[PDB]
Assembly symmetry: C3
Homo-oligomer: 572 residues x 3
Amino acid sequence: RDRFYVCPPPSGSTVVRLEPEQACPEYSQGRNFTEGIAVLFKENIAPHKFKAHIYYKNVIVTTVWSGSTYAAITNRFTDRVPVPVQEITDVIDRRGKCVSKAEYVRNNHKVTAFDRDENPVEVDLRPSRLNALGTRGWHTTNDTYTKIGAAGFYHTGTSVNCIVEEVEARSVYPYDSFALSTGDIVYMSPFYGLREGAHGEHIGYAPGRFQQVEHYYPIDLDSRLRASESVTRNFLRTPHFTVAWDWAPKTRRVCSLAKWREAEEMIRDETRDGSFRFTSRALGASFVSDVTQLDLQRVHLGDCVLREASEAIDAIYRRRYNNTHVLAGDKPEVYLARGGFVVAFRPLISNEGHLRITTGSAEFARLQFTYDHIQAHVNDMLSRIAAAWCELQNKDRTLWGEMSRLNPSAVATAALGQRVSARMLGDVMAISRCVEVRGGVYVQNSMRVPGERGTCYSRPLVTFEHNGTGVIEGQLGDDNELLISRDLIEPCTGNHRRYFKLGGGYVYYEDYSYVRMVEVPETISTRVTLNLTLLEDREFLPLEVYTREELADTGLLDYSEIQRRNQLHALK
Amino acid sequence: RDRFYVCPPPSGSTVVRLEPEQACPEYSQGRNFTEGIAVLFKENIAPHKFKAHIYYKNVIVTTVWSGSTYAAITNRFTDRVPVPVQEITDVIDRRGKCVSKAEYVRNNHKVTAFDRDENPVEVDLRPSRLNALGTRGWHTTNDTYTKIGAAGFYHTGTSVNCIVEEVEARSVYPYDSFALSTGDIVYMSPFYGLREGAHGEHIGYAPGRFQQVEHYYPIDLDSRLRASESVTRNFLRTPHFTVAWDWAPKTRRVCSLAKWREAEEMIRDETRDGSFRFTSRALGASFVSDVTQLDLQRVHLGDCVLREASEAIDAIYRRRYNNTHVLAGDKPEVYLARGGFVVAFRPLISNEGHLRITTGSAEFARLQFTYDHIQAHVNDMLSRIAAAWCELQNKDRTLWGEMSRLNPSAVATAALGQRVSARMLGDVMAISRCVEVRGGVYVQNSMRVPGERGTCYSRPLVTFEHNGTGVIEGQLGDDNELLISRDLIEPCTGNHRRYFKLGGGYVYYEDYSYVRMVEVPETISTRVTLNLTLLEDREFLPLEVYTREELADTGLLDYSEIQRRNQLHALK
Amino acid sequence: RDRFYVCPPPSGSTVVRLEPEQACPEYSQGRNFTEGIAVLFKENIAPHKFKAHIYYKNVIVTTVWSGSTYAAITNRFTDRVPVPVQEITDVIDRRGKCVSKAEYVRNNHKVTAFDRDENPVEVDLRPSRLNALGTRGWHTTNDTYTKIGAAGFYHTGTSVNCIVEEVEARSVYPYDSFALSTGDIVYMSPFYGLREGAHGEHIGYAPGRFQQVEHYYPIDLDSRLRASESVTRNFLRTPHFTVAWDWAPKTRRVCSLAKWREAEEMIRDETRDGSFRFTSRALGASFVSDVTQLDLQRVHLGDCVLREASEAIDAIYRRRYNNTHVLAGDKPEVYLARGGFVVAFRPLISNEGHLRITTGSAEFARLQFTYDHIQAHVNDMLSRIAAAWCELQNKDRTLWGEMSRLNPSAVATAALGQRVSARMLGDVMAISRCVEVRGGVYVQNSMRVPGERGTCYSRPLVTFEHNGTGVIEGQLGDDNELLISRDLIEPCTGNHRRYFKLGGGYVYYEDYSYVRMVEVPETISTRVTLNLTLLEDREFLPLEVYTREELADTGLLDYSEIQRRNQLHALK
């Protein structure tokens, strides 16, 4: 049951016009780009690894007690002993042998020891047995001298094993000490020398123990050779051994940074208060930096950057671009991106202080990229929709001005969302409200004009009442509008069926006479449908591949769990 | 070649009306928020670190054999020995000296030893040499006594070094034992005492070894001092040394949780079956919890939470809000978020059991946030589009009712997507189909009415055939509709050019006479364009900064790789 | 101030028509799916852990010097010694005792030792004390024999402790050696045997040391038992102990892969150059693989896959699907997904070479999923919008053809975006431009026709000038169009107010006479509004829960930091 309406004639009391076309939203100028090739450098967490050699003699003095039926070991004193630098160069290198005696200082006292307690003779250096992921080694003896029995007392045997070993060395920042595959820590920089500016490294020893030998040629101790190309060799004489390694300039062996990824399709994009954004589609990562370059000089040991960067970058240019684009500037540009990454970037042109800790994750970089990508897209495509909508609104207004001629009251009603009565005062609209009536309205069976044959009424005659208890003669208009003056008249026609609107239902008229009240179960739609649905809630539960527990348990031995045990020998 | 159509007069057989305006989709009420300040706590994986002191005497009994030309070490027996608590307090503390003799029990036998094998005299405690990231230490001697020669036999020397060392201590959960910078594991809780409820900690020793000293004043052993403010000192007497550290209540030194991040702009939002969602724009993370608070009491050692939370939160309130907002409640609220994070949250008001394992990642938290953010946006803006579309469909229907007067057949055709013939029965539409004809249709050169001068035909005369082999006289209507009755007549005019539609092409008429068949290569469009493009496939390849291999190799020494080696002395 | 326009009569010089309806964009066929159940397998980084037993005798030979007032330990030589296999089986197993003497070879010499230096008697194996997370153990003695004094010389004591220990064993890839809870590395495969194809494992020993005992029954050494079900027992005789463990086939104990996650709602989807995409809503991860299955045979030790996969999968089918769906094929399908994950997938049907390194992250998998999800949605819903827009443009054209009858010039102007003059030549449009005039245009006070009473002019009379200095008589049209011929005439009416458009403002006329120049501050809009807003910039700052620093510091002891210290005994 929808309302009935009487529409008083619109006087020029209120005058309105049709809202004119509006200015339609523009987009943005489209971001400025800079194509190019970039290399990403992380903080170098890796230790410095070099090869080295150990020379030590293996002093074991065992004392046995022989008796009636048995022999028993009362003692076994092992101790390692340093082979002198000359003994290395003049005997082990030159001849491949080693003196079977070790004259060393222990407890600030010059002492000695003899293999088999016999006389000092030079012995051949034989290889070891072998392996299970183990390096090279050499020794002089296969056994350790002990006591020849004859029941009675305690004889004390003395063996001496001359050992040369290939060992892998390891120094971590700041490299003022290193360590050997054998567990032994050397309290000095592997870059210490006597050269230009080496002397300025760290030594934890008396300078007599340290000694450098230039133009050394590293003899290989199996199948001999020297061979080509000489080395400056470092010798350190410790209380328990001697170590020899190849000295080289610090600045050339280690870097604080380390090449991580290359990016052939790298894109830089500046927006807002000075901020570059390096993004790689291949990687799937975005890197926000400043616009100011990194003064690479403010980095302790960062020379490998420009080196290895110029290298890779050029390698790719040869490999992908050299017939289409050209390098920009001479050197590549260098920026400190967020999260401790270093970006060396050289732009592509078509022929037409403190040190950095890299987060062990670049998760932000990819979350950036991903959001930055979608955001870009939906913003573009929604701006396109916003623009078309306005253009469509702009064009549709030509249809509405035309209709405000034939029917300015219907226009005005739609626009205002309420039933108004309107009509044109030339180029403008005069407007008034519409007042409700009750359901107490009655229709008449006759539509034929009494006073005249031939001319009938077009639309039904009604007697509607101001309230629900009166009478006024008028006729029916469109959309339940009750008119007053009864001058909607047409000539009579044969074959005359008519339907008219009344509240909710309709009314039928055959041959200008009332008949019945109809339904309208049949409809017709000019509507274009648009079923959008919502994006659903998702639940991101914690997903780790490896927990930290598992990550620690990977090792064969746990030094904490073993000391934890071996101590409890308040026991077994 | 599109079709021709004959449209039989629409009788009231089928009656339809124009589908009325529809109810337009509303949005959601807009989510309810709760601004505020939050602190995030992770599971504390860090060990408990305290300072401590070691007191031990260094017993080395060496035996030498002197001879003709040499001396040789036959043995060297080192062993560490505990300094008694009284010797600490009465000699080392009080005087700064140490007895050069060590009376200890070994093999369940009271034994002793003398430095230089001489008489017990009190010796000054001198500092050590120094450093390379090494703490403080003290000793009494710089050398170790050995044998004075005179060729002949085996003399046995005995040295004793009194050593006090500053050591860094480390206890991990559940702290029922700790360990020292020197490698030594103490099988007891660092919180064990004799106080109120300490006695209930773990000891792996006989109570005689343990001893507490209240109102101790920690003398500093270089440049002396006691000094201000006393300590309850713990003394443990081990077989190889004595350790002294500061006892303090367990509940006050360690927590199971640990402050991770603060969030000044934290937002909580409840939706669906009881679920809060803490999100920080700064962080870039979302944290789903329950609505029930965490009973912090069900956590073993979780007191640092409310402490350090109330601290930071307040610090920020002073720093950002105290003139605009106000704290809510008294205490902050506490929730267990997904992934083992603890959220202490105190809302902002404008003046107007078991323990937790924190995932070593919060990746879910940020993936949540990111999806939760976009989803929010596209859902809003697509609902806005959906709403406007319906409102636009609602308003456009006023244009379609108007047109169903001038031309109800064109309306009805568009709506139904097929060629229908329709016309108004008052307020309703009567509808019929349209039937095809063949291409075998012919046009006539004349458009002039024969029977009358002055009046011509408006639209061309055609003789169309029901099939492709007949004849019926009719004339041409719009859009290739073939009419029947030939009464589309107008007065004749000079300057008369006309084009009419025929299949695909058109037909020209000059001065009411046939001429030729034209093309129409010129078009005009009322269309608003909308070029949307699709979002492209992206490929997220695995991107790790550091592999686990590199992550293990960071250490200077690998206890597994060294034992792996030292054992192979089935060798060198 | 907008322009005035004169519109020359449109001749047939330019003829155009209204652009016809266009073909509307279709969607895609909707992707093809394959529901099912999947299990995810990662690379197994875990070591192989088995139980084992150690048998060794504890030889400590101490030598004391007794004197006047004291006794002093001059030496203490500990050494571990292997218990023979027969002694294990015939004494320790059978009887639960152990001979108080150890006949071992040391320095390639058969030697012996006696507890208390007395005669060999069999002694009972007692339990140890206990614990602090420590396993079982047994020994024979609680003390170590030393010297009975009587002042004078150096007596040498000899104790021997028989020890059996329960130890936890650990082998890592490739398991050609293992290690014990006690720190001891055994250089041999735990799967070595003498069986079919075991003999082919690694041994670093002489075969005499190795010995296998079939149908062994593992006696438990406290409260005895054998008991049920026999074992093939391995015995290795090392220089310092004996180890016994249970041999079993290698292929059955270890796998190179390891079950990680299960997925009940797993979805596979093929698109483009052969690529599956396994996605789980629960997990929140997507896994791109090839279409070719993984030949599981090309994997060293990958048998646990099909085992444990068929297990879980079936368990779930019973648990969720068995009344709705059915398994597909017999065996499950197996694919190598990106990032080193293995996917075993068995489809669901409604009743109707080299080895793999798994990245310690699956971050790509979830970033994939997340982007892949949104991309899917916005692409769908934007295609829906694109489709409706075209359908709406298609239907609206029926309104524009109707209007090109009543007003073809207004249509043509909107469409062309410029002021044109047009009119119908039957079924086609003739078109011309419109030429500007100046603001120098004048309106006349009179609207009454002089020559006739009764008939007035409808729209104002103007004298507009080609330039800004002429005269031509015409009248005013719509939208500031200046006409020429003055034949817009109507009968005169009482109650006559009129507004007309002039540049920007309007002009009022009462009773067919000029009055004033009005404003139009009242407007009316047929516009549907659409306020879209943009998605805002987000900043993803680096967010780590635990830095690698913290991750290393978790351990009680650092073997690198302790050796680092203990060495500096160039000191204290």
